[model samples]
Target: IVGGYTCAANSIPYQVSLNSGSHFCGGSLINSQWVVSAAHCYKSRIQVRLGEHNIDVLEGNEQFINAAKIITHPNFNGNTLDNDIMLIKLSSPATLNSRVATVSLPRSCAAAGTECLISGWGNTKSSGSSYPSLLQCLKAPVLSNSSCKSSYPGQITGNMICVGFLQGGKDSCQGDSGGPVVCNGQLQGIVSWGYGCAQKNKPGVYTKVCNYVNWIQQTIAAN
Candidate 1:
């Protein structure tokens, strides 16, 4: 098992602004036109602020991309938290810069047991409060299909990818949903759900990006 760590030093590049208030989560620019994230991240109103960590407002150094439209997975079930992926179409294409850039989504991803990185502004310690101003990250190995099925039984399906240690100190929690689980700099998953926030024996469950490639392309093609 890999160890837990913090992403505050690395700087989280995504921010969501809603009527409730702005919240921070890690997101990757998939291309000049789209921002990929967890579907639940959307509230009544959302503005995708990229390239900076400023939560209250977008700094001049960043690109504030207004969401022209949001397309969540058609089969997404809020109750089960299944198919929890989405795409945000930007009003205009963002210019790539050092701080503002895209992350490559894998055409084909690593098999089970590969190590991956998960990051967000969620709770740090299992029982601790959520991080208000910084982001955190952790490393975990992908669970094999057999191990994942044994652990989650009927809960995990082919659409979901599992990660983290069975012992579980590190995990993805609230606010971490919709963030990236990157393997070798390629997107492998989007943090989706689990038993509870950072529960032992329950690794973070995420939407498998590769598995839904066709769905994603079809959805985007319709736009």
Candidate 2:
């Protein structure tokens, strides 16, 4: 994350690392057996690591588990990045503790100007191979959809929400897809896409999680 800070150890208990040998995307553990992420982060096989602070070390609190099933939004559009949400069913339930727990789901859509937290292990810069072992975080405000629409122009959809600085400095970037966009201790969005790491007027776009509240519950109950 550009212009972000390293997250305090165990401060982000719900954040998870979506890995295939190495960390690739970030996700949130919404429940003991289910995780929320971006549809774009889908893979044939995925390893979900929970309670991870530093990606390079063996933190004793970590839970290593494989996905038993992955369910991406059926209406997801890759080109426009609409409905870019996904859910993963863990092979086993995660043991809840202080260092590993679930994040609450938002009861309603996040209003504009809401200052939310976005955390991930993405690149520190827009370009180059600068990836951090410690999870990064940035506090960005939610931009109005009207303004977001003007920025992307015919690209931003109702399924997506924009968050970041219009001045260009901090944002979630590559390898941070599927990470959490939290507001008021609830999951509001899923890191989906952006014009760049943090560019002028090109704020980070995310999958509006509030819109899929029912879908998440039904999917988990059925599966």
Candidate 3:
């Protein structure tokens, strides 16, 4: 059965330094002797910090990890945001501390209709600015294949999964992509896209972590 606690380290709000520090939503962890994050988070001088309650105070409690390599999905399409995930290999593995720990990825699918937790430092309100100090979280039940397809007609393809309120009050928003969607203590999905941030009649969409399990295993094995 899937099981584990969600962590703040897995909800990192990435800022692209090379892009003038533009914030991009992402999640990551200090695992496998390196730091891993979405490839899109990479920039010329990528800086990853964890453990701050707010962005301004990020340096106070944060540990900065300089990325040595940024690996984007080989098949990534910029225009479609398809295959939009990546990993950053840190210069070195981070020292585990109270505010830092790695999240576990699922070994297998936890079955449909399981409840999962979604967290981020993205916009709290649908159209608001990203949160600075506060990380927010909410629950979404894993959707059945048929229900997910019916709910998101053209959008719920095999590579993606749907979650959150159908009527829309909570969801991963702008600046929240590439973050984790955890269920039963295991990483289930990565925030990818949705119709909009908390839009009415729409729920958030995520990259199917299960579908990419083989890819993840291969990537880590090769590294």
Candidate 4:
């Protein structure tokens, strides 16, 4: 996360790290056994780690659980990055505690200019090996779809939401995909894709969580 700060340990309880042998992407715990992430982050094998603040350290509060099922959005388009969302059903339920908890889903869509907090263990720079050991967070505001469209003309879709400064600086980057973009304590977005790390006029685009709330709940209930 460029232009962000290190998060307080366990402050973002719903945050999770998607790992194979090591951390790859970030995700959010939405319930006892389900996590929400970006469709592009999916791999054959995944282990979800909860209550993680630092990636290289073993904090006793952490819970590492295998993912039994990974359901990417049916209509996700890799070329255009539309509907870039996914759900992972855990092999076992997470033991909820002060450091491990679920985040609430949004009931309504976030309006433009609504500031939100995005946290992840992504790279801190636009290039090189600047991945931070501790979780990083940035406070960014939602950009209007119209404005976002102009930034990436003919690419931005309704399924996507942009959040960051048009002039660049603070934004989500590599390894942050599938992480949480939260507003008012509710999950509102998922780190999807962007032109670069934090380039001018290229705000980080996210999977609009409000559009998939029903799909998420139904998937959790039916599975």
The local distance difference test score of model 1 is: 0.70
What local lDDT score does residue 2 receive in model 4, on the 0 to 100 scale? Answer: 95
- Residues 45-143, candidate 2: write the lDDT tens digits: 999999999999997989999999999999999889899999999999999999999999998998899989999999998656599999888998899
Of the two candidates 1 and 4, the one with more favorable lDDT, higher being better, is: 4
- Candidate 3 TM-score, C-alpha based: 0.81
**Candidate 3's residue-wise lDDT over 1-223, tens digit each?**
0011233543533221111264455565626444444445546666665554455544565666666776777876655555666776667766666566676767787687889887665666644453544555677887777766787676566766777766767777755566777788777877777676776666777777776667766776677
Give candidate 4 regions above 4 Å deviation. Answer: none
Provide TM-scores for the models: 0.87, 0.98, 0.81, 0.98
Task: Give the Cα lDDT of each candidate.
Answer: 0.70, 0.92, 0.62, 0.93
TM-score of 2: 0.98
Give a tens-digit lDDT track for model 1, residues 1-223.
1235645532544322222345644456777888788887766456676665535444577666677888877788887778888888878988877666677778796788888877766666555464645446687889887777777888887788888777776778776777788888788898887877556677778888887777766777888
Candidate 1 weakest ten by summed lDDT: 10-19
Candidate 1 wrongly placed segments (more than 4 Å)? 1-3, 8-20, 24-26, 54-60
The true-versus-predicted C-alpha distance at residue 212 of model 4, in Å, is 0.5
